[PDB]
Design a protein around this ligand. Structure first.
Ligand SMILES: Nc1ncnc2c1ncn2[C@@H]1O[C@H](COP(=O)(O)OP(=O)(O)O)[C@@H](O)[C@H]1O
Ligand SMILES: Nc1ncnc2c1ncn2[C@@H]1O[C@H](COP(=O)(O)OP(=O)(O)O)[C@@H](O)[C@H]1O
Lengths: 449, 443, 153, 140
């Protein structure tokens, strides 16, 4: 429903031969770049290579971000697409190379089958049994809980460990509640009151729920999608146990930490065992670093290590800059704003500025996508602004002009509505002329320089 | 498996004769760089003998001349028996700790303490368990267990009954017991009892019964770095910081105590010290404060050997406004020896591209290999190696069995090399954002 | 479907209508029966698992008393037999490929003695295999008027 | 009330049943040979007070859970060359996604060791639940 800058892009619009159709899937042109992005898509779906780099190089507005979004749509929702700008790397909580590693590991997926081994029932009886600790100083402790669980099919009595009773205490369970006990974690969930007690006459909005069907004891098979980053984080700041560290970890403020390479190599071995057990399959995906010129020489130096990793994702960089100074390396200038050293690692896909007829065709696609009807004179007038000023500028006029048309009661945008939109809504260069013309005047009505 | 094909996957070692240290023209995945590979072979001898402390070696050379390749060769030829620490210099700029702390930690990771410990361990298939609960539980119980060679009953103490009931041990389970501590690990399930396992899905695997003695004195060899001993001693569960990474700046009196303690264990023979190596890739990204620290951190008897790589010419040292060879201060370079790597000849480019093509799954026609070699001479070894993957994917899409010249030519046309992309930005200059921020969006 | 059914059942119950729901899957009669118990609707059920005396009485119950809102009814076990003429609404939650059977089901309501105008709803889901079902059924009912017309004798 | 069914041989089985001396085993001819053996009055000509069956093919649309299932199942048709399975499996999610795979009490992936139950039958009515939950990252 809501329409954004790239809502018309649906894919790369390629033939089965890997050749670009001149207008397909929302694209016009960029055919050589769309074909190169098609080969990138097939590099990813092959899931055989680690740590290949791609640079989308080309001026602002030449569809580099459209192409990266089209890759994400060609890959589909199974494969991790991890998009960031270079400005996102500058965390205050952790070093910049940490968020590089997190995003590298968000780009690597895992699908894993999990057995939940579990107990369910209406709580029929519940009875604690106690330890008379002589000299600990904390007084007594509870040694076990005996609890009776009843389902529709059968019944059990469980002698719970103290740490599982603490889970039940946290869950505020009472007799006649229906509860769930995941033995994997030792976590307890209160599902509700038993429907045997269903009555209006309690002030609190209780969940009255039926008795669980089947056996009290069950094993559930669940297929889970996780990334390596989800595993890293789960084991860095643990919260799954009923131990005291896990317990207090749920109360303290969330905090990112500079996760060590020891934890990452340990989790590689954990995942390798899930793969060898056949319960998991690896789904390596891609990290898209938009605005990659906003990185710095320390980031690029770190990618030289990170891309050597034997399970690194595929990395797609976009840059829009000519010969430019490398950030943090103020004496060094290079093409794309990328160090010469790191540029040797990339495959560069150049993107090119549009012809007037391509711009005219994009205007029609975009008008159809925003749902607005134009006359051909209107489409030509907007296309002229796309040629004379900028594609982005002319596409920004469609929504204002549609309102201005509707305000006069006409449902179709014609040249008068664009002629008004041009005058209400200036571009960067007409505005820069107003600045420059006025800036001869000082005093009250000058622009501040 | 998990491990995919990466840039260095073909490197299996240094490719050097163990008797003479003469490098072979190609072996173990390394082609050429013979003078540099011989020097790296002498450094491996220094590392493996452990005698010398705190040598620093710089691998200096142009980009893509095998500086990382040789570093991977050394790591692979030391194997798992020695601490090898791979630091990117960019990592020292932590927010969690100072640069010199991060350099101390990196040095401390690179010295191992090697410790040998026995345990009696009991391993076998469970024939039976009975437990008496009276009703508070665990009053008494008996375990029957077997191998293919032996069967025994054990009377169990109540804390072993708690271990057994915790790990839900049942008949047919194949278990190991570390009887020095009584943790029990369920190695698997016997096939002979498969039908007892009514709650196990069809995906369940089954083992054969264990072999020999039910009880064995297994000997374990541990290597723990000095950094691990430091971090263990930092707080009540300090070892967790080896994973979450939130070590603070660990106080130096802790380290001094540990240095004394380990020298004590060495002289008592309780432990051995295993000096490893620290690799610092892109050492030129360190600053003048890092170098003045490293100067004196190398002087310890608990210093590893350090190995460093630089692409840089006469270049500005970070944290100062003057320039020095390799980007490194002469103050530091006095304590360093340099190994220099050269550019490749065309037959070396041909061989490296061949090895890269055989490490990848790529059937490559001779004319495609010749074309990729010429591209290598003109566009560089990395670009030609990136075209191998690309041409395979193009060949596959047209259903071809081999990568032909046709596929390399599509790859060359679709993806620019750095020199063509530099030309592209120079010809496209007004449409790209220049260093003055100016750009023209118009046609 | 169940969303659009829930809206439709509310509009019908606020309308005072009484409804027969046909299913091609008896497990959907179980799931639907949960939803009904989780709301205020008094209901009855027939399908191919019920014993014949239960069929006799549940039909008699439904025809007896207007407090019962909804009658869940499997397509084949429930489409063929006796009058249900104090319904007024028929919903095919799922539609049989053989259009005759849906016709029999509809005409358990649309029958001699029928109290009010029968309205039939069919909960077609756009873009699913359900479209093929209703196409095949509509083709077949056309063929079944090519291959007969006229009184006979 | 619906003799014609799927095809004409499936009509012959009903005609053979009544008159197997006559019938054993061009469409316009049929109406003139069935006429002695069939009678079919129809509710437009008869019982005119029973006003016509008002009908609404609703053409409602999938929910998000259904289309997530549907697309993963429709992907199998692209892999094909099994519709004898899939038409019902599609029809199942058309009716309700819990028929295909029922939604249930759920939790995050647990990245840890625990001792799972090997037999439900041998567990009995009284059982001790120890705390088995343990990390797979296992520092020695
Ligand atoms: N070939 C194309 N076909 C259709 N729309 C395009 C094309 N290229 C760019 N656009 C649209 O024009 C706008 C500018 O492109 P964008 O990708 O943002 O440029 P940049 O390279 O600066 O990211 C976006 O709204 C994008 O959807
Ligand atoms: N002598 C060699 N033998 C085999 N492979 C090599 C050799 N030199 C470089 N390579 C490979 O070519 C690529 C580029 O060299 P690399 O060592 O990564 O560059 P740098 O020297 O800039 O670190 C790597 O994939 C590396 O494995």
């Amino acid at each position: 429903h809501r329409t954004a800058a790239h809502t018309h892009i649906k894919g790369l619009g390629l033939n089965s031969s890997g050749i670009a159709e001149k207008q397909a899937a929302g694209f016009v042109g960029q055919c050589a770049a769309r074909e190169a992005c098609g080969v990138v898509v097939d590099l990813i779906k092959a899931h055989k290579m680690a740590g290949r780099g791609v640079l989308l190089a080309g001026g602002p507005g030449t569809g580099k971000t459209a192409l990266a979004l089209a890759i994400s749509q060609e890959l589909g929702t199974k494969i991790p697409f991890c998009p960031i700008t270079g400005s996102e790397i500058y965390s205050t909580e952790v070093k910049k190379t940490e968020v590089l590693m997190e995003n590298f590991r968000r780009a690597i997926g895992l699908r894993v089958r999990e057995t939940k081994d579990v107990y369910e029932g209406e709580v029929t009886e519940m009875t604690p049994e106690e330890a008379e600790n002589p000299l600990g100083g904390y007084g007594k402790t509870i040694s076990t809980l005996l609890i009776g669980l009843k389902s529709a099919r059968g019944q059990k009595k469980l002698r719970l460990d103290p740490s599982i009773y603490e889970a039940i205490q946290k869950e505020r369970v009472q007799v006649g509640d229906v509860i769930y006990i995941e033995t994997n974690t030792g976590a307890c969930k209160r599902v509700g009151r038993s429907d045997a007690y269903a009555t209006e006459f309690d002030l609190e909005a209780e969940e009255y729920v039926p008795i669980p069907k089947g056996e009290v004891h069950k094993k559930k098979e669940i297929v889970q999608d996780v990334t390596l980053h989800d595993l890293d984080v789960a084991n860095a700041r643990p919260q799954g146990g009923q131990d005291i560290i896990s317990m207090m970890g749920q109360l303290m403020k969330p905090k990112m930490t500079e996760i060590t390479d020891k934890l990452r190599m340990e989790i590689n071995k954990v995942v390798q065992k899930y793969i060898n057990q056949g319960v998991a399959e690896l789904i390596p995906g891609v990290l898209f670093i938009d605005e990659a010129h906003m990185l710095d020489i320390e980031c690029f130096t770190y990618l030289n290590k990170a891309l050597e990793s034997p399970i690194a994702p595929i990395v797609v960089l976009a840059s829009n800059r000519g010969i430019a100074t490398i950030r943090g390396a103020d004496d060094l200038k290079a093409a794309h704003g990328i160090p010469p050293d790191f540029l040797q690692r990339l495959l560069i896909i150049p993107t090119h500025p549009y012809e007037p007829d391509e711009i005219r065709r994009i205007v029609r696609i975009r008008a159809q996508t925003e749902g607005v009807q134009l006359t051909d004179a209107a489409v030509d007038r907007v296309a002229e602004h796309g040629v004379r000023i900028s594609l982005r500028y002319c596409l920004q006029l469609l929504a204002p002009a549609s309102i201005l048309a509707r305000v006069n009661g006409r449902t179709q945008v014609d040249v008068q509505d664009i002629a008004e939109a041009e005058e209400l809504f200036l571009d960067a260069r007409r505005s820069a002329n107003i600045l420059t013309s006025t800036g001869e005047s000082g005093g009250l009505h000058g622009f501040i320089s | 498996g998990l491990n995919l094909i990466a840039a260095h996957s073909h490197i299996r070692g240094l490719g050097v004769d163990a008797d003479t240290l003469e490098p072979r023209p190609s072996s173990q995945g390394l082609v050429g760089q013979e003078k540099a590979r011989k020097a790296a072979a002498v450094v491996l001898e220094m590392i493996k003998q452990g005698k010398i402390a705190g040598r620093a070696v710089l691998i200096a050379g142009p980009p893509s001349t095998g500086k990382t390749a040789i570093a991977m060769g050394m790591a692979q030829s030391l194997g798992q028996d020695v601490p090898f620490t791979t630091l990117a210099a960019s990592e020292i700029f932590s927010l969690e700790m100072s640069k010199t702390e991060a350099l101390t930690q990196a040095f401390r990771k690179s010295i191992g303490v090697r410790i040998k410990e026995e345990s009696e361990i009991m391993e076998g298939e469970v024939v039976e368990i009975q437990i008496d609960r009276s009703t508070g539980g665990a009053k008494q119980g008996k375990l029957t267990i077997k191998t293919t060679d032996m069967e025994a009953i054990y009377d169990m103490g109540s804390k072993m009954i708690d271990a057994m009931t915790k790990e839900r041990v049942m008949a047919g389970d194949i278990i190991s017991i570390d009887k020095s501590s009584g943790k029990i690990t369920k190695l698997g399930r016997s096939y002979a009892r498969s039908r007892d396992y009514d709650a196990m899905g069809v995906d369940t695997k089954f083992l054969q019964c264990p072999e020999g003695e039910l009880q064995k004195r297994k000997e374990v060899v541990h290597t723990v770095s000095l950094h691990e001993i430091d971090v263990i001693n930092s707080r009540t569960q300090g070892f967790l910081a080896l994973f979450s990474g939130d070590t603070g700046e660990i106080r130096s009196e802790i380290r001094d105590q540990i240095n004394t303690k380990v020298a004590e264990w060495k002289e008592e023979g309780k432990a051995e010290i295993v000096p490893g190596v620290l690799f610092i890739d892109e050492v030129h990204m360190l600053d003048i404060e890092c170098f003045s620290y490293i100067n004196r951190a190398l002087e310890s008897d608990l210093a590893p050997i350090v190995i460093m790589a630089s692409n840089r010419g006469v270049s500005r040292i970070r944290g100062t406004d003057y320039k020095s060879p390799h980007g490194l201060p002469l103050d530091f370079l006095d304590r360093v020896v340099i190994i220099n790597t050269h550019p490749y000849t065309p037959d070396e480019l041909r061989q490296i591209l061949s090895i890269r093509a055989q490490e990848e799954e790529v059937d490559l026609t001779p004319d495609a290999l010749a074309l990729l070699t010429k591209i290598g001479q003109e566009a560089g070894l990395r670009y030609a190696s990136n075209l191998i993957t690309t041409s395979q994917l193009i060949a596959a899409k047209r259903r071809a069995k081999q990568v032909g010249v046709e596929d390399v030519q599509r790859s060359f046309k679709l993806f620019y090399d750095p020199a063509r992309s530099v030309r592209f930005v120079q010809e496209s200059e007004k449409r790209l954002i220049g260093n003055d921020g100016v750009v023209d969006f118009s046609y | 479907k169940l969303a659009k059914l829930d809206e439709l059942l509310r509009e019908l119950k606020e309308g005072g209508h009484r409804v027969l729901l046909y299913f091609q899957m008896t497990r959907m009669i179980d799931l639907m029966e949960e939803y009904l118990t989780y709301r205020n609707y008094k209901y009855c059920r027939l399908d191919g698992s019920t014993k014949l005396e239960d069929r006799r009485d549940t039909v008699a119950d439904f025809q007896t008393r207007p407090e019962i809102f909804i009658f869940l009814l499997s397509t084949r076990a429930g489409g063929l037999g006796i009058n249900l003429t104090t319904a007024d609404t028929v919903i095919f939650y799922d539609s049989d490929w053989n259009p005759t059977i849906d016709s029999q089901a509809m005409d358990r309501a649309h029958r001699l003695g029928q109290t009010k105008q029968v309205t039939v709803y069919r909960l077609i889901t756009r873009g699913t295999i359900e479209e093929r079902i209703r196409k095949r059924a509509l083709q077949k009912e056309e063929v079944q008027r090519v291959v007969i017309t006229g009184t006979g004798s | 009330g619906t003799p014609i069914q799927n095809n004409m041989q499936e009509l012959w089985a009903l005609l053979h049943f009544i008159m197997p001396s006559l019938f054993d085993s061009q469409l316009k001819r049929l109406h003139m040979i069935l006429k002695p053996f069939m009678l079919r009055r129809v509710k437009k000509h008869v019982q005119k007070e029973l006003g016509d069956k008002i009908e609404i093919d609703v053409f409602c649309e999938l929910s998000y859970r259904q289309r997530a299932m549907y697309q993963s199942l429709r992907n199998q048709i692209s892999i094909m060359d099994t519709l004898m399975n899939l038409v019902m499996q599609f029809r199942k999610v058309c009716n309700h996604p819990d028929l295909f795979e029922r939604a249930d009490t759920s939790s995050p992936f647990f990245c840890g060791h625990f001792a799972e139950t090997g037999s439900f039958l041998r567990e009995g009515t009284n059982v001790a639940l120890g705390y088995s939950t343990r990390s797979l990252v296992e520092y020695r």
